[PDB]
Curated annotation (Swiss-Prot), chain A:
Binding site for Mg(2+) 2: 98
Enzyme Commission number, as recorded: 3.6.1.13, 3.6.1.58, 2.7.7.96
The encoding gene: NUDT5
Expression induction: Overexpressed in cancer patients with a poor outcome.
Stated family: Belongs to the Nudix hydrolase family.
The protein, known as: ADP-sugar pyrophosphatase
Top-level taxon: Eukaryota
Cofactor binding note of this UniProt entry: Binds 3 Mg(2+) ions per subunit.
Location(s), subcellular: Nucleus
Annotated consequence of substituting residue 33 to A: Reduces affinity for substrate about 6-fold. Strongly reduced catalytic activity and strongly reduced affinity for substrate
GO terms for cellular component: cytosol; extracellular exosome; nucleus
Names of the cofactor(s): Mg(2+)
Subunit structure, as described in the record: Homodimer. Interacts with PARG.
Residues annotated as binding Mg(2+) 1: 82, 102
Length: 194, 194
């Protein structure tokens, strides 16, 4: 019933562009929307986010998260390990690569979402959410070696799965961080499943 | 270590602007970033709210109430938590209850309110409160609920059982061209993982 008529480039950076979108509302009235897109999509999605489940015998299961300075936020954020999918990279392969670069952990794919939208009122940006298990007991995950690309500075924070939401709330109240909306959504559902 | 040095406006729309962010990296070196922000954030603790609406009725499984809308930036229909921007002077809780009634017809009860969480912190400074709300589906107020949609708002209500949310979203993605929101998908994954 609704569809795009035209897109007008407003401003194109190296990484991000601003468009005015003309679309038909369901009444047959023509309307405009200010929209953001990345310049980097070629891919099933722009990015991957990894839900990394660190499994060590006789330990609580942990979710592995990363803490980074985010220039748009002007502060530190707690997030699932994540990055843009390389030209000709599979979402699964991008997930294991990003997980290893950001955490040093070597993981196994459990499941992979279809492309899901990040902020569909603002942007066309999409990701694959890739569930990965990490055998914390294997030699390769003993002293995990993180491989940061140029300009990437990442701290690893592993939090117990069974208490994730209370642990995230404590970090926010203590360390003045911003928790990622997908991390918080996952944490909430772990509590609401009961 | 890291902080913002300057924010240079590149392009300002009515709703969305693009900025050149100069920040200090932790090596002590000056770097830049292309950052998106909204034009609409005054004193609000966040841009917006997203509502996790748990529809509770005697001798029914709990449902998660979702909305389906055309999203110009995506060029298609999206399944999301009910959501909108926080009005100047409005609490996150009032915005959540108001957006839920406007988009679904349901009159909710506040359960929980997150801190401000980041929508896509590599791209934008955009934040929301995630507000958990219960809906007493047994109350006559919530019997034949009519969406009161705003000018240019066209919303379909989709209520899915919490106990089968991920499978029901997967069946919707199979049967038509539609994107699930990353927060809905993250919430549905955690319900499975718990
Ligand atoms: O043009 C828009 N772009 C992004 N977000 C919006 C949010 C609104 F509420 C109205 C218009 C826009
Ligand atoms: O300046 C940037 N803005 C948004 N996203 C990015 C993603 C990159 F991988 C590198 C730079 C940027
Ligand atoms: Cl798992
Ligand atoms: Mg990353
Ligand atoms: Mg990277
Ligand atoms: Mg809305
Ligand atoms: Mg609305």
């Amino acid at each position: 019933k609704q569809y795009i008529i035209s897109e007008e480039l407003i401003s194109e950076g190296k990484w991000v562009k601003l468009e005015k979108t003309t679309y038909m509302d369901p009444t047959g009235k023509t309307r405009t929307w200010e929209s953001v897109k990345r310049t980097t999509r070629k891919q099933t999605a722009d990015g991957v986010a990894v839900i990394p489940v660190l499994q060590r015998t006789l330990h609580y299961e942990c979710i592995v998260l990363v803490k980074q300075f985010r220039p748009p936020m002007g502060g530190y954020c707690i997030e699932f390990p994540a990055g843009l999918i390389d030209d000709g990279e599979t979402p699964e392969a991008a997930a294991l690569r990003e997980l290893e670069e950001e955490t040093g952990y070597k993981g196994d794919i459990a499941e992979c979402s279809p492309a899901v939208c990040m902020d569909p009122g603002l942007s066309n940006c999409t990701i694959h959410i890739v569930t990965v298990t990490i055998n914390g007991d294997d030699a390769e995950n003993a002293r995990p070696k993180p491989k940061p690309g140029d300009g990437e500075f990442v701290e690893v924070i592993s939090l117990p799965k069974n208490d994730l939401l209370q642990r995230l709330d404590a970090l926010v109240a203590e360390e003045h961080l911003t928790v990622d909306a997908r991390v918080y959504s996952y944490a909430l559902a772990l509590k609401h499943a009961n």
